[PDB]
Coordinates of C-alpha atoms in Angstrom, one line a residue:
Chain A
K833 CA 25.4 -1.3 -13.5
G834 CA 25.2 -2.4 -17.3
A835 CA 21.4 -1.2 -17.6
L836 CA 22.4 1.7 -16.0
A837 CA 25.5 2.3 -17.8
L838 CA 23.7 2.2 -21.2
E839 CA 21.1 4.4 -20.0
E840 CA 23.5 7.0 -18.7
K841 CA 24.8 7.5 -22.2
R842 CA 21.1 8.5 -23.1
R843 CA 21.6 11.4 -20.5
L844 CA 24.8 12.5 -21.8
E845 CA 23.6 11.9 -25.4
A846 CA 20.7 14.4 -24.5
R847 CA 23.2 16.8 -23.0
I848 CA 25.5 16.5 -25.6
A849 CA 22.9 16.8 -28.3
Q850 CA 21.0 19.7 -26.4
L851 CA 24.5 21.2 -26.0
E852 CA 24.8 21.4 -29.6
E853 CA 22.1 24.0 -30.1
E854 CA 23.7 26.0 -27.5
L855 CA 27.2 25.7 -29.4
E856 CA 24.8 26.2 -32.6
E857 CA 23.9 29.7 -31.3
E858 CA 27.2 31.1 -31.1
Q859 CA 28.2 29.3 -34.6
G860 CA 25.2 30.8 -36.1
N861 CA 26.1 34.2 -34.8
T862 CA 29.5 33.9 -36.9
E863 CA 27.3 33.4 -39.8
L864 CA 24.1 35.6 -38.9
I865 CA 26.5 38.5 -37.5
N866 CA 28.8 38.3 -40.6
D867 CA 25.9 38.0 -42.9
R868 CA 24.4 41.2 -41.4
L869 CA 27.9 42.7 -42.0
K870 CA 27.6 42.1 -45.4
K871 CA 24.6 43.7 -45.9
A872 CA 25.5 46.6 -43.6
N873 CA 29.2 47.0 -45.2
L874 CA 27.5 47.1 -48.8
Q875 CA 25.3 50.0 -47.5
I876 CA 28.0 51.6 -45.7
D877 CA 30.3 51.5 -48.7
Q878 CA 27.6 52.9 -50.7
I879 CA 26.8 55.6 -48.1
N880 CA 30.5 56.5 -47.8
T881 CA 30.9 56.9 -51.5
Chain B
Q78 CA 33.0 -62.6 17.4
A79 CA 32.3 -62.8 13.8
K80 CA 28.9 -61.3 14.1
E81 CA 30.4 -58.8 16.7
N82 CA 33.3 -57.8 14.3
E83 CA 30.7 -57.5 11.5
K84 CA 28.9 -55.1 13.7
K85 CA 32.1 -52.7 13.9
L86 CA 32.2 -53.0 10.0
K87 CA 28.9 -51.8 9.6
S88 CA 29.2 -49.2 12.2
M89 CA 32.7 -47.9 10.4
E90 CA 30.7 -48.1 7.0
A91 CA 28.5 -45.0 8.6
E92 CA 32.0 -43.2 8.6
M93 CA 32.6 -43.8 4.9
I94 CA 29.3 -43.3 4.3
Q95 CA 28.9 -40.0 6.2
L96 CA 32.0 -38.8 4.7
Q97 CA 30.6 -39.6 1.3
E98 CA 27.5 -37.5 2.3
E99 CA 29.9 -34.4 3.0
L100 CA 32.1 -35.6 -0.1
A101 CA 29.2 -35.8 -2.6
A102 CA 27.8 -32.5 -1.6
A103 CA 31.3 -30.9 -1.5
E104 CA 32.4 -32.4 -4.8
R105 CA 28.9 -31.4 -6.4
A106 CA 29.4 -27.8 -5.2
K107 CA 32.6 -27.3 -7.1
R108 CA 30.5 -28.3 -10.3
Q109 CA 27.7 -25.9 -9.4
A110 CA 30.4 -23.3 -8.8
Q111 CA 32.6 -23.9 -11.8
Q112 CA 29.2 -24.0 -14.0
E113 CA 28.6 -20.5 -12.5
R114 CA 32.1 -19.5 -12.1
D115 CA 32.6 -19.5 -15.9
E116 CA 29.0 -19.0 -17.2
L117 CA 28.5 -15.9 -15.3
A118 CA 32.2 -14.6 -16.1
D119 CA 31.6 -15.0 -19.8
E120 CA 28.7 -13.1 -19.5
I121 CA 30.1 -10.8 -17.0
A122 CA 32.3 -9.5 -19.7
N123 CA 29.5 -9.3 -22.0
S124 CA 27.0 -7.3 -19.6
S125 CA 29.4 -5.7 -17.2
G126 CA 32.4 -5.4 -20.0

């Protein structure tokens, strides 16, 4: 149980670590989509004027 | 009668000798269990704990 308990953390560690990449996808979208809006808003603002 | 009475003493000694055989093993069992009831217990808190 002790050896399996320590090994159990490795399974969740990879899941908790791999899950970070999944969460980073939405996190990156907030930075990538927002960054695209700045480039789009700059062109939309110039096109509007 | 002294020789006959002495035969009862040696015969009765078998009871004390037989009781010592189980008493020595029973008493020694506590030492073996105590050595394991405490050593493994302290290690259980480190391995299982």
